[PDB]
Structure formats: structure tokens, C-alpha cells
Amino acid sequence: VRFLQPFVNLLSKGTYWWMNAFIKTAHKKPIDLRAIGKLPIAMRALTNYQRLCVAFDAQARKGARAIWRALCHAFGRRLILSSTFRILADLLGFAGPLCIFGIVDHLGKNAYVLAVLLFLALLLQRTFLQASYYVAIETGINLRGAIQTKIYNKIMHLSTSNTAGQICNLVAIDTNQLMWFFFLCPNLWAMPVQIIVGVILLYYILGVSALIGAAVIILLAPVQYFVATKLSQAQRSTLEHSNERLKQTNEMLRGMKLLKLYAWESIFCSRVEVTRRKEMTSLRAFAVYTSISIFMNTAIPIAAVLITFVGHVSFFKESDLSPSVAFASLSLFHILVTPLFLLSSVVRSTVKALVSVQKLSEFLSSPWRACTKYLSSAGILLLSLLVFSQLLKHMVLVAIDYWLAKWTDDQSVYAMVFTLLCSLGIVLCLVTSVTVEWTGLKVAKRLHRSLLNRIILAPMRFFETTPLGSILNRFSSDCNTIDQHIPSTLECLSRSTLLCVSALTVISYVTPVFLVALLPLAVVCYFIQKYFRVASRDLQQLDDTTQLPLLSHFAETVEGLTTIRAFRYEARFQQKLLEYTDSNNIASLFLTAANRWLEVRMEYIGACVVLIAAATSISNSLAGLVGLGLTYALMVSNYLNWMVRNLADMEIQLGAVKRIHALLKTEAESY
Ligand SMILES: CCOc1cc(CC(=O)N[C@@H](CC(C)C)c2ccccc2N2CCCCC2)ccc1C(=O)O
Known part of the structure; x- marks a missing residue:
């Protein structure tokens, strides 16, 4: 048992401090199924299966509703504990904008104490939030173990x-x-x-x-x-x-052999290309919807801020816009964005798993070179337009957030310039969205065509030596990855990195002394990121590679069921399934604990950054620029952990482009 998450004092349960040791080891020598622990007794397939079966007996003493109520009876204590952590983290995250309000109202007219209380509440809130995520993940994985074991027992x-x-x-x-x-x-x-x-x-x-x-x-x-x-x-x-x-x-x-023997490869390649053109016709609509999603997600908040402030000043002829009031409202808008965006995903997953439980009831009742090659496949025109649009869009974003501070203290002129810059921002953001999607499509097209043509020209000895599975898998899974995941993930990595750099630039322009403190934290950040990545890679691969046995086993058991029941070998096979699902559970659990460790450390770095910015800006001002620095340093932590998650998500997906280009360089017959 090397997953001693239950077996530590509440502080290291909260900050995943034990993981440190693990991660350090996991940086020197690779992670093996001997290095990862064995699950505790509390979270086993047998323990959770027996808990669920007891809940099922209780519910049967008193269908889909039966399964839902049994799952409640079995995992509700931990589910509502996670919900309590999450709601406390939500309220304590709201404790931030009103504190910015208090700070800026004080210094524009008690400030330092407000800053240190903002720091404390932020630190505690981020810790509670990550603990909520962790408890939810752990109870979800325990439920997966219990349900796998139950459907196999059925x-x-x-x-x-x-x-x-x-x-x-x-x-x-x-x-x-x-x-x-x-x-x-x-x-x-x-x-x-x-x-x-x-x-x-x-x-x-x-x-x-x-x-x-x-x-x-x-x-x-x-x-x-x-x-x-x-x-x-x-x-x-x-x-x-x-x-x-x-x-x-x-x-x-x-039938590559026969085709090459009578040289029918070009005609079949043309037919495959016609089918590829139809698939591209559909991918155009898919990419249009993805672009609309990105653009709406980024542009609805801009327009919200615009309408809020302008209508407050001109239409309502309402209260004059003070720095404290305006920047508190801006921080609250930023806190409001994420729930409004992810609520759709939560509802969709809810109805999806509701359908899944109905179905289960019905059943139970019976790599820099890869990046270089990818960007070069795009061309200098699209790449230059994309980079210019991203940079100028983030410049316009910081520009409007700074024009807010200059606005606060000819109010018509300020309102008009603010409106103009918000329109410029939304247009520029639509440009960057449509451009990243168009670039994704063009690169997918070029890469797929070149790949198909370069294996058409391949010799016969190549096909005899190379496994058919790999040559088909490159077109089956990696071209799919380039078609769907690389555009969105590349766009979001660009946005995360540029927003992080923008936030640090803003809180350095407001606070010239923070820059001196930025370099230590920077170093710390780098180190943590690095170590997480290596661990997060190994674990991830492991977590994938243990899932193939499990499904495989299920397949086997369904195929030779009558033989296994004839042998009376049912208990041995249930034992093998418990072992497989325990391997999968320990893999996924350690992966999620490494994720929690990284996100907790990045949130603590964000908390130190917001404390430094608050202290030093409140000092230098003892106005609207202080509010600007306060908001940006407040939310640097999200940019940071989102950017490192996206970098980890980016390298794995870019490996597919790397190996596509690897196969692209096979020898060709001088036809
Ligand atoms: C913050 C990321 O850590 C997780 C967090 C969770 C649980 C969770 O409330 N997620 C929120 C995101 C957070 C930022 C609110 C969410 C909600 C709706 C749809 C997707 C998602 N997402 C989950 C996948 C990755 C992020 C988008 C599970 C799993 C993880 C994980 O480490 O994989």
C-alpha cells in the first residue's frame, strides 16, 4: 500500500503532501506496478461491492430507481462531504471580489488587514476546492469498481x-x-x-x-x-x-499486394480521397460549431462587462463608477464565467449517466519536432495570422481592463472609447477563433493527403515487415486526433499561456517590485510543472495500459461463459476480475492524486502571488490600477493550472502528429 491518502494527518490529506515523496521517486526511475501501491482495504472491489450489495438488500427490503437509491445509500456520505467542501469553496471564492472592493474603497478614500484576510481566505478556499475534487473523484472510482464487479457477477x-x-x-x-x-x-x-x-x-x-x-x-x-x-x-x-x-x-x-501487382493503387487511393472529401465536408460544420463555442465562451463576458458599465453610466445615469465598485464587479464577473460555461456540461453528463443507469438496470434485470512539422504544414500565412491575432487579442483584452481603471476617476468620452475597445476585442476574438479552426482543418487535410500518398508509394517489403495494425491505426486513431482534438487543445493552450503572461505583465506594470519576487516563484513553478509532467505521463500511460486487460477479460468471459460455468471455475474468474479492476483503480487513483497535487501547488503559488501584489500595491497607493493588479493577481492561479493541464494534454496529443510524420518518411519506389 503506497497510496496512503487516507492514512495521514488532515493537513497532508488536504495538501497531498505525501505525494511529494512519490513524485520525487517517480522522477528518477520510471513508474512500475511495483512502485505504485496496492489499494487500501477501504477502497477495494470486494469492499465496495459488499457495501453496494448491503445497500441493495436494504433497498430491496423497502428498476432504475432502486439502483439510484442503492447507490445513494452506499456512497452518499462521501458524496455530500464532497458537496460540502465544494459549496464552502464556492462561498469562500466569492469572499474575494468583495474584499477587492473593500481594499480599493479604503485606499481610494483597514487595507492591509483586508489584504491578509483575502490571502488567508484564498488559500483556504483553494485547498477546500481541491479536496472537494479529490473526494468526488475517489467516490466515483469506488462506484466504478463496485458497479464493474456487480455487472460481472451478473x-x-x-x-x-x-x-x-x-x-x-x-x-x-x-x-x-x-x-x-x-x-x-x-x-x-x-x-x-x-x-x-x-x-x-x-x-x-x-x-x-x-x-x-x-x-x-x-x-x-x-x-x-x-x-x-x-x-x-x-x-x-x-x-x-x-x-x-x-x-x-x-x-x-x-489487398495492397494485389493492387501493387497490377498497379491499381492510384484508383483505390482516389476513391479513398473522395470519401475523405465527404468527411471533410462534415468536418467543416463540426469545426464551425467548435469555433462558435470558443468565441461565445470568450466574448459573452466581454459584452457583459461592456453593457454593465456603459448602461450603468449612460442609460441608467446611475452612480458614478468608482474603482472599488467597478473592479469588484469585474472580479465577480470573472468568478461567474466558469460556472455558466460548465453548467451545460454538467447537465449533459447528468442526462447521459441517467440513460446509462437505465441501461444498466435493463441489463441487470435480465516533441518540439512534431509541433514544428504541424505548424509548417499550415504555411506562413495562416500561422502568422493566427499568432498575430492571438497576441493582438490579448493586448486588446489587457487594454480594455486598463481603460477601466483610467475610466473610474468628460465621462461620455471614456464610455465611448470603452465601447469602441470592447467592440474591437470581440471582433479580434472572433478572428482568432475562426483562424485557429481554419488552420486545424487545413493542416488535417494536408497531413492526411501526404500520408496516404506516401504509403501508396511504399514498397512491398515495407508492407510485409510492417504490421497491418499499425498502418491502419495511423489512419484510424491519429488522423482522428489531428481532426478533432489538436485544434481545440492548441487553441486553448495558446489562450492559457497568453492569459497567464498577460496577467503577470499586468501585475508587474501595476507593481514594479513584484517582478523581483516573480523569479523565485517562477523557478518554483517551473520545477513543480516539470516534475508533475513526468509523473503525470507515466501514470497516464499506466492508467491506459491497465484498462485493456479489464475490457478484454469481460469479452472473454462473455464468449466462453458456458465453458467457465461448466468447469465451475466461476470463483477463479471473479478473482481475476477483482485483480484487474483493482489494478485499474489504483492506476486511476494515483493519476488523480498527482493531478490534485499539481493543482494544489499551483493554487498556493497563485495565493502567494495575489498576497504579494495586494501588499505591494496597497503600499504604493497608501487607485484603480491597484484594483487592476488585484483582480489579475487574484486569478493568476486558474491560468497557471489550466495552462499546465493543457501542456500535459498537448504533448500527448502531439505525439500522434509526431508518429504520423514518422510514418510519412517511409521509402518510396522510383516509379
Ligand atoms: C479541475 C480539473 O480536475 C478535475 C475535476 C473534476 C470534477 C469537476 O468539478 N470538474 C469540473 C471542472 C472544474 C474546473 C469546475 C468540470 C465540470 C463540468 C464539466 C467538466 C469539468 N471538467 C472535469 C475534467 C477536467 C476539467 C473540466 C473531475 C476530474 C478532474 C481531473 O483532474 O481530471
């Missing part, structure tokens, strides 16, 4: 009269949707509370104009939900053509 008893692939994917995707509903279940209860208290605080701060602002920002959640629905629709319509193109590529690759 596979054992079912009759020979009865769909093996259905059971295999019921273990593969339906239990997954259930576990992810349990991952996001605290959010389902704590996002409405968050949004309500946010709108209430905004109203209390800004009078009546804040309600117009909060309505405009809330108008983001339904639009995001509609966009996500259209995106899944386009996803299915793309998967159709992708499956047909895959079958055609498999035809071309099985």
Missing part, C-alpha cells in the same frame, strides 16, 4: 439464451458515464448556488445595472448548451463518414 449467472459487444461497451462507456456523473455531481448542486449568490452580490454592489450585466452573462449557459448539442450532432454525422473511410482504407491495406 454476467456469471445469466442464461446462454442471450450481445457480447454490448456488455463490453456497457463496461467500457456506460459505467464511464456513470462514474463521470459522480465526478461532476458536486458541481451539479453547487453551480446554481454559486450563480445565484454571484448575481446577488453583483446586484448589491452595482445597483440595478448589475442585473442587466448578470442577465447578459447568464445568457451564456443556454447558448453553450445549444452549441454543445449541435457539436455532438455534427460529431455523429462525421463518425459515419469516418467509419466508411476506415473500412475503405482497410480494404486498400489488406
Whole structure:
């Protein structure tokens, strides 16, 4: 047992301090199934299975509702403990904007004490938030173990009269949707509370104009939900053509010998290219919806701030905009963004796992070179336009946030220039979104065409030596990755890095002394990031590689069920399944603990940054520039952990482009 998360004092339970030792070891020598621990007794497949079966007996003494109530009876204590942590973290995160309000109101007219209390509340709030995430993940994984064991125990008893692939994917995707509903279940209860208290605080701060602002920002959640629905629709319509193109590529690759013998390769390649053109026609709509999602997500808050402040000053002829009031409202808008954006995802996952539990009831009742090659496939025109648009968009963003400070203290001219710059910002953001999506599409097209052509020209000895599985897998999974994940992830990594650099630039321009303190933290940040990455890579690979046995086992058990029951070998196979699912659970649990460790450390670095910025700016001013620095240093932590998550998410996905280009360089016959 090397997963001693339950077995430490509450502080290291809260800051995942034990993981430190592990991660340090995991940096020197690679991670093996001997280095990762064995799960505690509290979280085993047998322990959670027996807990769930006791809950099921209790519910049967008193269908889908039966399964939901049994899952409640079995995991509700920990589910509501995670929900408590999450709601306390939500309220203590709201404790930030009003504190910025108090600080800027003091110094524009008790300030240092407000700054240190902001620091303390921020530190405690981020710790509680990460602990909430962790408890939700742990109870979700325990539920996955119990449900896997239960559906396997049901596979054992079912009759020979009865769909093996259905059971295999019921273990593969339906239990997954259930576990992810349990991952996001605290959010389902704590996002409405968050949004309500946010709108209430905004109203209390800004009078009546804040309600117009909060309505405009809330108008983001339904639009995001509609966009996500259209995106899944386009996803299915793309998967159709992708499956047909895959079958055609498999035809071309099985009979490559005969084709090359009579030189029919070019005509079959042309047919595959026609199918690829149809799939690209569908991918265009998919990318349009993805671009609309990115643009709405970034542009609804800009317009919300614009309408709020302008209508507050001109239309309402309302209170004069003071720095404290304005920047408190801005911080509350930034705190309001994320719940409004992710509420659609929470609801969609909720209905998805509801369907999954209904189905389970019905069943149970019976790499820099890769980046260089990818960017070079785009061309200098699209790459230059993309980089210029990203940089100028973030410049316009910081520009409007600074014009806010200069606004606070000819008010018509200020309002007009603020409106002009917000329009410039939304146009520039739409440009950067459409450009990243167009670049993604163009690179996918070029890379796929070159790959197909370069394996058409491949010699026969190459095909005899190379496994057919790999040549098909490059077109099957990696071209899919380049088609779907690389555009969005590259765009979001660009946004995360540029927003982080922008925030540090803002709080350095407000506070010239913070720069001196930036370099230590910078170093710390770097180190942590580095170590996390290596650990997070190993674990991730391990977590994937242990899932293939499990599903495989399920498949086998469904195929040779009558033989296993004839042998009376049922207990041995249930034992093998418990061992496989325990390997998978320990892998996923250590992966999530490493994630929690990194996000806790990055949030603590963000807390130190906000404390330094608050202290030094309140000092130098003892006005609106202090509020600017305060907001940006307040939220640097999100940019930081989002950017490191996106970098980890970026390298793995870029490995696919790397190996596509690797296969692209095979020898060609001088035809
Ligand atoms: C903050 C990321 O850590 C997690 C967090 C969770 C639980 C969780 O409340 N998630 C929120 C995101 C946070 C920022 C609110 C969420 C809500 C809706 C849809 C997706 C998501 N997401 C979950 C996948 C990655 C981020 C978007 C699970 C798993 C993880 C994880 O380490 O993988």
C-alpha cells in the first residue's frame, strides 16, 4: 500500500503532501506496478461491492430507481462531504471580489488587514476546492469498481439464451458515464448556488445595472448548451463518414499486394480521397460549431462587462463608477464565467449517466519536432495570422481592463472609447477563433493527403515487415486526433499561456517590485510543472495500459461463459476480475492524486502571488490600477493550472502528429 491518502494527518490529506515523496521517486526511475501501491482495504472491489450489495438488500427490503437509491445509500456520505467542501469553496471564492472592493474603497478614500484576510481566505478556499475534487473523484472510482464487479457477477449467472459487444461497451462507456456523473455531481448542486449568490452580490454592489450585466452573462449557459448539442450532432454525422473511410482504407491495406501487382493503387487511393472529401465536408460544420463555442465562451463576458458599465453610466445615469465598485464587479464577473460555461456540461453528463443507469438496470434485470512539422504544414500565412491575432487579442483584452481603471476617476468620452475597445476585442476574438479552426482543418487535410500518398508509394517489403495494425491505426486513431482534438487543445493552450503572461505583465506594470519576487516563484513553478509532467505521463500511460486487460477479460468471459460455468471455475474468474479492476483503480487513483497535487501547488503559488501584489500595491497607493493588479493577481492561479493541464494534454496529443510524420518518411519506389 503506497497510496496512503487516507492514512495521514488532515493537513497532508488536504495538501497531498505525501505525494511529494512519490513524485520525487517517480522522477528518477520510471513508474512500475511495483512502485505504485496496492489499494487500501477501504477502497477495494470486494469492499465496495459488499457495501453496494448491503445497500441493495436494504433497498430491496423497502428498476432504475432502486439502483439510484442503492447507490445513494452506499456512497452518499462521501458524496455530500464532497458537496460540502465544494459549496464552502464556492462561498469562500466569492469572499474575494468583495474584499477587492473593500481594499480599493479604503485606499481610494483597514487595507492591509483586508489584504491578509483575502490571502488567508484564498488559500483556504483553494485547498477546500481541491479536496472537494479529490473526494468526488475517489467516490466515483469506488462506484466504478463496485458497479464493474456487480455487472460481472451478473454476467456469471445469466442464461446462454442471450450481445457480447454490448456488455463490453456497457463496461467500457456506460459505467464511464456513470462514474463521470459522480465526478461532476458536486458541481451539479453547487453551480446554481454559486450563480445565484454571484448575481446577488453583483446586484448589491452595482445597483440595478448589475442585473442587466448578470442577465447578459447568464445568457451564456443556454447558448453553450445549444452549441454543445449541435457539436455532438455534427460529431455523429462525421463518425459515419469516418467509419466508411476506415473500412475503405482497410480494404486498400489488406489487398495492397494485389493492387501493387497490377498497379491499381492510384484508383483505390482516389476513391479513398473522395470519401475523405465527404468527411471533410462534415468536418467543416463540426469545426464551425467548435469555433462558435470558443468565441461565445470568450466574448459573452466581454459584452457583459461592456453593457454593465456603459448602461450603468449612460442609460441608467446611475452612480458614478468608482474603482472599488467597478473592479469588484469585474472580479465577480470573472468568478461567474466558469460556472455558466460548465453548467451545460454538467447537465449533459447528468442526462447521459441517467440513460446509462437505465441501461444498466435493463441489463441487470435480465516533441518540439512534431509541433514544428504541424505548424509548417499550415504555411506562413495562416500561422502568422493566427499568432498575430492571438497576441493582438490579448493586448486588446489587457487594454480594455486598463481603460477601466483610467475610466473610474468628460465621462461620455471614456464610455465611448470603452465601447469602441470592447467592440474591437470581440471582433479580434472572433478572428482568432475562426483562424485557429481554419488552420486545424487545413493542416488535417494536408497531413492526411501526404500520408496516404506516401504509403501508396511504399514498397512491398515495407508492407510485409510492417504490421497491418499499425498502418491502419495511423489512419484510424491519429488522423482522428489531428481532426478533432489538436485544434481545440492548441487553441486553448495558446489562450492559457497568453492569459497567464498577460496577467503577470499586468501585475508587474501595476507593481514594479513584484517582478523581483516573480523569479523565485517562477523557478518554483517551473520545477513543480516539470516534475508533475513526468509523473503525470507515466501514470497516464499506466492508467491506459491497465484498462485493456479489464475490457478484454469481460469479452472473454462473455464468449466462453458456458465453458467457465461448466468447469465451475466461476470463483477463479471473479478473482481475476477483482485483480484487474483493482489494478485499474489504483492506476486511476494515483493519476488523480498527482493531478490534485499539481493543482494544489499551483493554487498556493497563485495565493502567494495575489498576497504579494495586494501588499505591494496597497503600499504604493497608501487607485484603480491597484484594483487592476488585484483582480489579475487574484486569478493568476486558474491560468497557471489550466495552462499546465493543457501542456500535459498537448504533448500527448502531439505525439500522434509526431508518429504520423514518422510514418510519412517511409521509402518510396522510383516509379
Ligand atoms: C479541475 C480539473 O480536475 C478535475 C475535476 C473534476 C470534477 C469537476 O468539478 N470538474 C469540473 C471542472 C472544474 C474546473 C469546475 C468540470 C465540470 C463540468 C464539466 C467538466 C469539468 N471538467 C472535469 C475534467 C477536467 C476539467 C473540466 C473531475 C476530474 C478532474 C481531473 O483532474 O481530471
